[PDB]
């Protein structure tokens, strides 16, 4: 099992929708210590997004059920204990990713684009931990998310063109972090609106390789704006 072979196995796992296997292959690739190609990072990001996102989805359903079972104590206690098992899975997954990012990906990123990609991912995985945190514990996790997102935001504004998909994707998620985690509809809207407005003024900068992702993210930016201004 050498790097290119792990990557092909990861792509096979993806077509099979076996995201556990896909994540394990990309974790092995990361752990070999070389900087990742664009394709490798993308596969790492998709793999772990599916692994964590399954648990985020389950958590939402079980916590909701937990809430409607006030007064049914055996039912409530069961949904609680199940929410907590799910919560510990999700935390383990976020911690795995965050460890990879701190040990291998962030310190080794030599280009601004990769730097922003991994800082955004750091921001996203702390954001998922924040969804499931309480207390002074929550405030620290929210701060780690905000810091990763802010640093990526600053590098991208300095180093990346407005239509760059990574810059747009960073705006989209940071904007969601403001809306949903920091509770500021106003600041989320402003971040999203300026990202959309700046890229729509610079279409000519799209390339055949980037136009599909950049225009999709623009659409999602405006969709969130539409949602939040209803």
């Amino acid at each position: 099992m050498d790097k290119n072979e792990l990557v092909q196995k990861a792509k096979l796992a993806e077509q099979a929708e076996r995201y556990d296997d896909m994540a394990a292959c990309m974790k092995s690739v990361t752990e070999q210590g070389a900087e990742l190609s664009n394709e490798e990072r993308n596969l790492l990001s998709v793999a772990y997004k599916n692994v964590v996102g399954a648990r985020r989805s389950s958590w939402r359903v079980v916590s909701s059920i937990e809430q409607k079972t006030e007064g049914a104590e055996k039912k409530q206690q069961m949904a609680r204990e199940y929410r907590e098992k799910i919560e510990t899975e999700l935390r383990d997954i976020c911690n795995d990713v965050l460890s990879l990012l701190e040990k291998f990906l962030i310190p080794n990123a030599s280009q601004a684009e990769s730097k922003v990609f991994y800082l955004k991912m750091k921001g996203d995985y702390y954001r998922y931990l924040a969804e499931v945190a309480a207390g002074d514990d929550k405030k620290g996790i929210v701060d780690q998310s905000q810091q990763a997102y802010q640093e990526a935001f600053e590098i991208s504004k300095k180093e990346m063109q407005p239509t760059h998909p990574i810059r747009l994707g960073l705006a989209l998620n940071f904007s969601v972090f403001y809306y949903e985690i920091l509770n500021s509809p106003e600041k989320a809207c402003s971040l999203a609106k300026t990202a959309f407005d700046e890229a729509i003024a610079e279409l000519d900068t799209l390339s055949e390789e980037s136009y599909k992702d950049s225009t999709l993210i623009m659409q999602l930016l405006r969709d969130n704006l539409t949602l939040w201004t209803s």
Binding site: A54, L172, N173, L220
Partner: peptide, 9 residues
């Protein structure tokens, strides 16, 4: 609908 982030599942 739901608000969007990326990557999605």
């Amino acid at each position: 609908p739901r608000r969007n982030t990326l990557p999605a599942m």
